[PDB]
Amino acid sequence: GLGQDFRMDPAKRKVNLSIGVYRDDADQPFVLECVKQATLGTNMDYAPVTGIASFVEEAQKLCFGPTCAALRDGRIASCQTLGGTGALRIGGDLLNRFVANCNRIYGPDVGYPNHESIFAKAGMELTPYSYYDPATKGLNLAGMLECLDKAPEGSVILVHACAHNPTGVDPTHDDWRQVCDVIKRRNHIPFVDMAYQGFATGQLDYDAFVPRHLVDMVPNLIVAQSFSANFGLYGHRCGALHISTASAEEAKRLVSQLALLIRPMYSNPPLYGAWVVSSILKDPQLTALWKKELKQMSSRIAEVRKRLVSELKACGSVHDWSHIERQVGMMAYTGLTREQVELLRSEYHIYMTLNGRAAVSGLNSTNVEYVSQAIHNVTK
Amino acid sequence: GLGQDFRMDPAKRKVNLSIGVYRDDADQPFVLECVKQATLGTNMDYAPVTGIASFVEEAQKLCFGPTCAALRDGRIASCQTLGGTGALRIGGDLLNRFVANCNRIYGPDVGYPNHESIFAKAGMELTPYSYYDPATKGLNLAGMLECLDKAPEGSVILVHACAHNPTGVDPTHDDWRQVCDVIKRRNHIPFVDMAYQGFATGQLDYDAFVPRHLVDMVPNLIVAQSFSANFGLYGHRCGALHISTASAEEAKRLVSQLALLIRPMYSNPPLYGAWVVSSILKDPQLTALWKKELKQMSSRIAEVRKRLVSELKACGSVHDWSHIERQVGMMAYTGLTREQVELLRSEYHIYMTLNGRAAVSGLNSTNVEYVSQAIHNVTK
Ligand SMILES: Cc1ncc(COP(=O)(O)O)c(C=O)c1O
Ligand SMILES: Cc1ncc(COP(=O)(O)O)c(C=O)c1O
């Protein structure tokens, strides 16, 4: 992380657009009011290996919603995990229990850096499908669909549910309907990384469209669910893993196998996050409060994207920045070149990674004008 | 399993001696006052991959002593882990990656069951050395020494620092001096599981003799350190891994390799327990209180062992129970036979595992007389 150089930078006017976590308009970490009001347990005894049971139940219901048949019929195997990262790893380690010939996983051509190592450790080579279009800083749907169609039948296909990291480029629900048809027809196994449900657009149901739509279409769906961003619980390491199966008996056999993976890795998961999420989701008042706060976070991110674009136009930039508003979530592929990123750092002390990814959570009312002028100056 | 059957058991007068965690004399979970008085962080941001730096620093000093030469020279590589379990796993994964033909590890013939699966996941087969003497319910030192001397040069040797789980049988410091001489002479790699420092005898320096004694004797010492029992932080999953090396340069490179193992496992470790331990160990008031609370927990366990033996004699048992007082910690190998354990359950509703292990943390002033009479009855 570029944090060290930013911190060491003596310049009076500097901006860190490399951060990985939410910040409010005052550039402060943001502890949710619903999290402050959550009730903790009183016992520090170990949780069960598969997690606090009420937490896992609420995580399932939040992921799949109130009218999910799979959930009703008990055919989903689930557990608490060490954030979304733990779910990706434990899920990856579980895949050979139900996927034949399981040595490859397909992910978007521009994707989340840690995915490669996670799945390598689990015995699978991450291989790309067409996804990001650098000319438009947007989606290459035709390319995605063709790659999925040509992949061997029974391939594992990694997809981001929403707020694609690092580009911010998300397919529409129309686009996802086409994607899921290919996944079903080719008998592929979807592995959904859902790290930003509710955080992405402020709408929990909309943001969970991809796992909810797939769970009825395929024999097995995997979902890695993170509570880091949407509850602001990052460092407490709170997530869940879900695998759908044909029957409650199949799900039970997979939960036993989950336990055999968890116990010799970390024995059992940390209490704090699970207490907080379970407390909030079982309380109507706290749940309502949480939903209001989700919208506050998602609206601020959306509005600062919109403000960046409008300020760029006000500065006199003649280039097109509409991708910044089309993209969703904290991470934006700006389209700035390596040279331009290097100039923003040297000349303006604005820090972002060399791929032109900007963490827009670092943008706010007090610096968006400065950053816009800088981006105009290095691109004009 | 047993715990479920216990909880399901209708019997009004029943005792669970199969638990894994400390209980006070009222049979309640026990949160330490020093933990209640600790100051938590305010920011829920992710910790560094290797953990909260102040916690890791305090963990090192607590393990090796503040004046440790290895520590002053910076030649110990350390990181925060998910309890002692995570330190065992990461340590094993590191050994198997970097030590040639490291596909085996030697552990005590009666040992902690999860050790076998932890090291199996790391690609290392756990194989026994003579340790427990069933005739005496005590130590077989000559057998241990002979086994360690015969193991191939450069073997990984797993040892419990104190409060051996599940037997309670510990070598004395005199004995450990003999063990460590063999380990040095044979160029073995010691892997110390220190799950109970201070919790074991109430004396933090005494309980850390094994790693402190070894760290100046061998080129590489590995220590898995748990804060679950000695801070009562079980479910918050707080531990540390330490690996000594020839130099600070080697240590720094090793820490880099730990990060490569951690990141695709769970990205970074949970804040809460690290906050608590760092807070306590940096505050003189909290540290002094913690030491007294540890002495009180350790003394309660020692005193109820003593009381079981004295009540067994009062009941009229003519058998020898001195092993119960010689053993150290929460776990006692009682020497009850399988049939005797089964009758304890069926006639007296006292629950132990069939190997005759009793968790004496489940014994207290309100049930020790009952349990003594029951144990007398089934062995007379
Ligand atoms: C796409 C994606 N997957 C997984 C993760 C890891 O999330 P967690 O902190 O819950 O492990 C992140 C968060 O940075 C992410 O952006
Ligand atoms: C000997 C031993 N090693 C390791 C562990 C695992 O401890 P932790 O909860 O810190 O992962 C235990 C605790 O039960 C243990 O008894």
PDB file of N, CA and C and ligand atoms in Angstrom, chain A residues 20 82-86 88 112 115 160 163 165 193 195-196 226-228 234 237-238, chain B residues 46 266-267, ligand 1:
ATOM      1  N   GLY A  20      -8.356   1.695   0.960  1.00  0.00           N
ATOM      2  CA  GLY A  20      -9.201   0.554   0.676  1.00  0.00           C
ATOM      3  C   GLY A  20     -10.486   0.534   1.479  1.00  0.00           C
ATOM      4  N   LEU A  82     -13.729 -15.579   7.954  1.00  0.00           N
ATOM      5  CA  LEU A  82     -12.903 -14.416   8.236  1.00  0.00           C
ATOM      6  C   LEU A  82     -13.035 -13.390   7.117  1.00  0.00           C
ATOM      7  N   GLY A  83     -14.111 -12.602   7.180  1.00  0.00           N
ATOM      8  CA  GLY A  83     -14.465 -11.692   6.101  1.00  0.00           C
ATOM      9  C   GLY A  83     -14.783 -12.395   4.793  1.00  0.00           C
ATOM     10  N   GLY A  84     -14.962 -11.611   3.733  1.00  0.00           N
ATOM     11  CA  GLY A  84     -15.097 -12.208   2.415  1.00  0.00           C
ATOM     12  C   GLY A  84     -13.872 -12.991   1.976  1.00  0.00           C
ATOM     13  N   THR A  85     -12.692 -12.576   2.456  1.00  0.00           N
ATOM     14  CA  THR A  85     -11.450 -13.251   2.088  1.00  0.00           C
ATOM     15  C   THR A  85     -11.494 -14.684   2.570  1.00  0.00           C
ATOM     16  N   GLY A  86     -11.861 -14.872   3.839  1.00  0.00           N
ATOM     17  CA  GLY A  86     -11.982 -16.227   4.394  1.00  0.00           C
ATOM     18  C   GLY A  86     -12.995 -17.073   3.620  1.00  0.00           C
ATOM     19  N   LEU A  88     -13.804 -16.742   0.437  1.00  0.00           N
ATOM     20  CA  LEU A  88     -13.191 -17.096  -0.858  1.00  0.00           C
ATOM     21  C   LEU A  88     -12.225 -18.259  -0.694  1.00  0.00           C
ATOM     22  N   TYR A 112      -9.683  -8.398  -8.740  1.00  0.00           N
ATOM     23  CA  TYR A 112      -9.206  -8.155  -7.407  1.00  0.00           C
ATOM     24  C   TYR A 112      -7.881  -8.899  -7.182  1.00  0.00           C
ATOM     25  N   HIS A 115      -7.359 -12.319  -5.388  1.00  0.00           N
ATOM     26  CA  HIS A 115      -8.077 -13.496  -5.873  1.00  0.00           C
ATOM     27  C   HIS A 115      -7.104 -14.528  -6.427  1.00  0.00           C
ATOM     28  N   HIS A 160     -18.023 -10.693  -9.678  1.00  0.00           N
ATOM     29  CA  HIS A 160     -18.257  -9.731  -8.582  1.00  0.00           C
ATOM     30  C   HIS A 160     -19.754  -9.359  -8.605  1.00  0.00           C
ATOM     31  N   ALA A 163     -20.264  -3.377  -7.491  1.00  0.00           N
ATOM     32  CA  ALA A 163     -19.069  -2.591  -7.200  1.00  0.00           C
ATOM     33  C   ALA A 163     -17.791  -3.388  -7.492  1.00  0.00           C
ATOM     34  N   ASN A 165     -14.296  -4.498  -8.072  1.00  0.00           N
ATOM     35  CA  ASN A 165     -13.032  -3.969  -7.564  1.00  0.00           C
ATOM     36  C   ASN A 165     -11.954  -4.573  -8.467  1.00  0.00           C
ATOM     37  N   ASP A 193     -18.465 -13.341  -5.652  1.00  0.00           N
ATOM     38  CA  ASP A 193     -17.822 -12.528  -4.621  1.00  0.00           C
ATOM     39  C   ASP A 193     -18.729 -11.318  -4.394  1.00  0.00           C
ATOM     40  N   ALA A 195     -18.938  -8.518  -2.015  1.00  0.00           N
ATOM     41  CA  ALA A 195     -18.245  -7.797  -0.942  1.00  0.00           C
ATOM     42  C   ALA A 195     -18.948  -6.503  -0.563  1.00  0.00           C
ATOM     43  N   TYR A 196     -19.934  -6.055  -1.351  1.00  0.00           N
ATOM     44  CA  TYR A 196     -20.506  -4.724  -1.153  1.00  0.00           C
ATOM     45  C   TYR A 196     -22.026  -4.675  -1.242  1.00  0.00           C
ATOM     46  N   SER A 226     -19.088 -10.525   2.338  1.00  0.00           N
ATOM     47  CA  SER A 226     -18.330  -9.690   3.279  1.00  0.00           C
ATOM     48  C   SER A 226     -19.203  -8.693   4.031  1.00  0.00           C
ATOM     49  N   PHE A 227     -18.950  -8.558   5.336  1.00  0.00           N
ATOM     50  CA  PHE A 227     -19.595  -7.525   6.128  1.00  0.00           C
ATOM     51  C   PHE A 227     -18.663  -6.380   6.460  1.00  0.00           C
ATOM     52  N   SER A 228     -17.502  -6.360   5.813  1.00  0.00           N
ATOM     53  CA  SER A 228     -16.500  -5.337   6.103  1.00  0.00           C
ATOM     54  C   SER A 228     -16.942  -3.947   5.705  1.00  0.00           C
ATOM     55  N   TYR A 234     -14.583  -3.831   8.881  1.00  0.00           N
ATOM     56  CA  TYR A 234     -13.327  -4.258   8.251  1.00  0.00           C
ATOM     57  C   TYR A 234     -12.389  -5.109   9.118  1.00  0.00           C
ATOM     58  N   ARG A 237     -13.126  -8.734  10.905  1.00  0.00           N
ATOM     59  CA  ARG A 237     -13.040  -9.921  10.040  1.00  0.00           C
ATOM     60  C   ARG A 237     -14.308 -10.759  10.072  1.00  0.00           C
ATOM     61  N   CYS A 238     -15.368 -10.195   9.496  1.00  0.00           N
ATOM     62  CA  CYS A 238     -16.686 -10.781   9.574  1.00  0.00           C
ATOM     63  C   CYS A 238     -17.226 -11.015   8.170  1.00  0.00           C
TER      64      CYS A 238
ATOM     65  N   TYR B  46      -8.847  -2.015   8.796  1.00  0.00           N
ATOM     66  CA  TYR B  46      -8.013  -3.216   8.794  1.00  0.00           C
ATOM     67  C   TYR B  46      -6.695  -3.034   9.525  1.00  0.00           C
ATOM     68  N   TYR B 266      -6.806 -15.067   5.011  1.00  0.00           N
ATOM     69  CA  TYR B 266      -7.820 -14.229   5.662  1.00  0.00           C
ATOM     70  C   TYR B 266      -7.492 -12.733   5.606  1.00  0.00           C
ATOM     71  N   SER B 267      -6.478 -12.384   4.811  1.00  0.00           N
ATOM     72  CA  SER B 267      -6.091 -10.995   4.519  1.00  0.00           C
ATOM     73  C   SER B 267      -5.376 -10.283   5.695  1.00  0.00           C
TER      74      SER B 267
HETATM   75  C1  LIG C   1     -13.987  -7.783  -4.379  1.00  0.00           C
HETATM   76  C2  LIG C   1     -13.500  -8.012  -2.984  1.00  0.00           C
HETATM   77  N1  LIG C   1     -13.458  -9.304  -2.516  1.00  0.00           N
HETATM   78  C3  LIG C   1     -13.034  -9.555  -1.223  1.00  0.00           C
HETATM   79  C4  LIG C   1     -12.615  -8.505  -0.405  1.00  0.00           C
HETATM   80  C5  LIG C   1     -12.109  -8.806   0.998  1.00  0.00           C
HETATM   81  O1  LIG C   1     -13.073  -8.475   1.958  1.00  0.00           O
HETATM   82  P1  LIG C   1     -12.879  -8.803   3.468  1.00  0.00           P
HETATM   83  O2  LIG C   1     -12.219  -7.657   4.175  1.00  0.00           O
HETATM   84  O3  LIG C   1     -14.281  -9.014   3.991  1.00  0.00           O
HETATM   85  O4  LIG C   1     -12.058 -10.060   3.617  1.00  0.00           O
HETATM   86  C6  LIG C   1     -12.657  -7.196  -0.883  1.00  0.00           C
HETATM   87  C7  LIG C   1     -12.454  -6.022   0.033  1.00  0.00           C
HETATM   88  O5  LIG C   1     -11.434  -5.338  -0.096  1.00  0.00           O
HETATM   89  C8  LIG C   1     -13.098  -6.949  -2.176  1.00  0.00           C
HETATM   90  O6  LIG C   1     -13.114  -5.658  -2.629  1.00  0.00           O
END
